[PDB]
Amino acid sequence: AMVKIEVAKPINFNRLITSKEAEVVSMRILNQPNSYISLFSLAKDEEITAEAMLGNRYYYCFNGNGEIFIENNKKTISNGDFLEITANHNYSIEARDNLKLIEIGEKISAFNLAEVVEYQEGKIVSKNLVAKPNLVMTIMSFWKGESLDPHKAPGDALVTVLDGEGKYYVDGKPFIVKKGESAVLPANIPHAVEAETENFKMLLILVK
């Protein structure tokens, strides 16, 4: 209802959501009163159009290539890219091939996300992208051997591994999330993470 996929488990969104010719497929995966996370798969040459939205929209592309026209301005989007679209803007999104997107929305130029944080030896580097009362998005790099101790968040977090692989724990239970996979760390339950076997990067989307 609020989390529509299994928690504390690695999931490959590329496999979870697919479209055949001429289809647009969508799925809500987290839903709260004033923010949500959805997935889209657009078949080649299909489009989604959005009228002047009451809140901001953010997109992370995990497959394919496309074009976004925001009030008549072509931005290109590709696998690995992140894009913010501010409130009160008409836009359309066109798929040039099979375009898959995570859409993060508040209800009321594209760049490569992994490249925004560097690895640093023995360190965790964190860069906050959005920080709002219903939505927090942060990108992090972990050098092998670095970890976060168990902690809780007041919302459900979706983590997606952008590079390498990470070892996550939810309420003491371990699971590996590999590059291209995601997992939900549920609200009010302790979780932790460790760069156990190699360096990794992740995007964290917390909906509160």
Side-chain angles (χ1 to χ4, degrees), residues 125-170:
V125 182
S126 156
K127 278 216 186 137
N128 182 243
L129 299 175
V130 177
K132 301 181 183 281
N134 304 135
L135 180 66
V136 177
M137 301 175 68
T138 294
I139 164 80
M140 318 181 66
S141 67
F142 285 72
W143 193 265
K144 176 184 182 184
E146 270 289 336
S147 62
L148 307 179
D149 294 326
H151 59 290
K152 300 176 177 95
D156 298 302
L158 178 76
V159 299
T160 307
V161 170
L162 307 174
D163 184 52
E165 67 173 57
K167 179 158 174 217
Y168 291 80
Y169 301 80
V170 169

